[PDB]
């Protein structure tokens, strides 16, 4: 399902954030501010279709928040059978991950110049 | 080989947590406790090689924490080039993920019976 | 000074918040959510020209944040001379306040119906 | 006249804080301490009749906290009718404020000398 | 000929601190109500942190200790100093029953009143090695 | 004929708890570094809260007690019970010196190692009236 509701939510969310004056200034400045970091947490919490939010400046990811329960399952689901059925302790390398993730990338501008980008996404473990 | 320092850290960390009385009782009880949830956060924060920590009871994942910066990059890395270089907006569907993640599974026991497990892992490219 | 920079900041800020899906749902629902409450705090902190932010539903003010230092002075300034110069303890009635405060009112809509409003303002103790 | 219950609460509250050793030392020192700042927040939260609390040294206001819902209404009340009834957007300049606010000023002393004061108040519409 | 000692500075700090807290309206209501409030609990922490001579603060209602805070470094040493020798000088690991402390602790007890009736008390103290 | 008593459940809980904490990488690094970290401080609080038999937890470096947490209700009573009587029954404000303490406290000491060298210790205990 790549329904428009989701597509829309992702775009509006990313856009809204991209238009915030202080978000723009922050990316420009390069200074790390934990309150901005915290600011992104609201979107994961209050918007069901947003499982991941990333705010990056031109150097890279600066702030980031994820739906910890949702994303956590991604890294567990596979190869959990052994420990659960025996009481066996072991190592397991997981190459890549299961499922798919829909993302929307939105650049961020300040005083006419691009200072970074914002990515917003939803995770899918099934398909339909 | 596969760096023993890391392998060690993962195992000790998971073991340590497995041996905590209240962690054992909690998994047995089935009740959800936010302080336990918070307890796991210390390991991500204070241990560099721990990017993911999961605590599950026999039903499934109960508590969980991730290094949000680390894991966030997983979902970005691929297809970030365009927006960064040409300043354009778009959708991009990512099937699975790039890189690899080393995990260690540790069962959890209470009064002789297994009540769940703990997974601890590090992400790589 | 009723310069456009300020006027603009107030309007954008209020508009931005009015367009947030979860802000709309929250006012509709009537449930009190402390994370929304906290959400408004970012605007006071990060935007210099915003000294006050109020979010009200149709019953009244629901969430609110103020620049505590800025607004605090309003209630002190007057009649502080005595205690400061003598060591006199006393009561003093102040009606109402000094200075002026520029505000912008923005309604909030959800599914086509108005569910409340948002007020954003800046305080002035002088004039120019 | 007023209401003595309130008058009393304001006075006790201010007095209590005045008598705290660390509050006295802090005003004397001039150093800014966020834990003291936080200390004042309890009074707004836990005491219904306290809408404003200010702690000032001889230079001026140093720490301060307000009942954000209470004080917020002051700045709204007056010109809210329009947006609420006709759903329209606009600017509105408010000269001063409506209502009245009862305050109590209490000096603060350290080693015999006055180092500041504490103001505690309640806001009223009528 | 004996010689006792009396530091009034400390004695005064303890009394003013306890009194101050006793006079707080919300402290009184809280003890009356019986409800547990973590913000009150936190409120007591300021006194340990900001007042050097206050190593212990206890707030009790008529049932018993309700809120409490201690200077963790100061009080911690009490439980170590005595049987810390072994672990510290190649012990290493062991069990030990300690009775009593030792050292001495000066306390001041202050009752708490609400609407004319006593609803509890406040104890404030300093520890001496 | 005397009769000692030995509750292994408790003895066990204390030892596993202390051991567990000793084995935490960041606990080891922290003691080595000497820097004070409030999150570590907070980390120790979980054990008091969630483990009934743990009334005291102390984490010390080679200099001394660094972090510490106590079951504030439990330990508070220690400092009250003895000269609690007068304030609770009569008036009644006063000063009181308590020499040492009543009751007994079972502790377990566990050293802490980092990169082969001992950087401190952890003490875990339960109080008995
Ligand atoms: Cl499997
Ligand atoms: Cl790419
Ligand atoms: Cl004046
Ligand atoms: Zn926030
Ligand atoms: Zn914690
Ligand atoms: Zn506080």
């Amino acid at each position: 399902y790549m329904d428009e509701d989701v597509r829309n939510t992702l775009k509006e969310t990313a856009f809204s954030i991209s238009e915030i004056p202080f978000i723009q200034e922050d990316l420009s400045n390069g200074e790390i501010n934990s309150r901005i970091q915290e600011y992104t947490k609201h979107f994961i919490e209050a918007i069901n279709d947003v499982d991941i939010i990333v705010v990056a400046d031109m150097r890279g990811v600066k702030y980031s928040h994820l739906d910890e329960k949702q994303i956590g399952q991604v890294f567990v689901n596979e190869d959990k059978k052994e420990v659960l059925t025996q009481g066996s302790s072991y190592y397991s390398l997981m190459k890549g991950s299961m499922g798919e993730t829909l993302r929307w990338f939105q650049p961020v501008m300040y005083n006419g110049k691009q200072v970074g980008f914002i990515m917003v996404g939803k995770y899918y473990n099934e398909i339909q």
Side-chain angles (χ1 to χ4, degrees), chain A:
Chain A
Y1 264 54
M2 247 61 98
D3 48 336
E4 276 58 66
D5 185 359
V6 172
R7 304 186 92 249
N8 200 20
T9 300
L10 300 182
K11 191 185 188 184
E12 185 183 341
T13 299
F15 176 76
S16 75
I17 298 174
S18 59
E19 297 290 327
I20 307 298
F22 66 77
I23 293 290
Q24 298 170 352
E25 294 176 23
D26 177 288
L27 292 175
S28 174
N29 288 332
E31 196 178 2
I32 309 176
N33 182 341
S34 64
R35 299 286 298 113
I36 300 295
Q37 210 294 337
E38 192 285 342
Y39 176 85
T40 63
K41 190 172 176 94
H42 298 274
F43 299 91
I44 303 298
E45 296 172 352
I47 311 173
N48 191 33
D49 289 334
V50 176
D51 300 332
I52 180 185
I53 189 184
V54 170
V55 177
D57 63 7
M58 303 304 263
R59 297 176 58 185
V61 172
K62 191 175 180 184
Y63 306 115
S64 172
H65 270 280
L66 312 172
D67 181 310
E68 290 171 322
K69 192 172 189 53
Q70 193 66 337
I71 306 309
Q73 288 271 15
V74 171
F75 299 94
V76 177
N77 195 13
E78 303 307 343
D79 206 43
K80 61 184 283 172
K81 196 178 177 89
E82 282 68 54
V83 66
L84 275 169
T85 63
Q86 280 66 10
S88 191
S89 74
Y90 56 85
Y91 289 99
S92 47
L93 282 169
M94 188 193 189
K95 190 196 179 182
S97 77
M98 290 268 297
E100 51 178 356
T101 307
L102 176 58
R103 312 105 83 211
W104 169 265
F105 292 81
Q106 181 76 24
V108 181
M109 320 283 205
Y110 183 68
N111 295 353
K113 295 247 165 175
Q114 175 171 347
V115 298
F117 73 82
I118 313 277
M119 188 276 279
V120 176
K122 180 186 179 67
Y123 175 79
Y124 294 96
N125 51 26
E126 263 56 325
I127 305 179
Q128 184 188 349

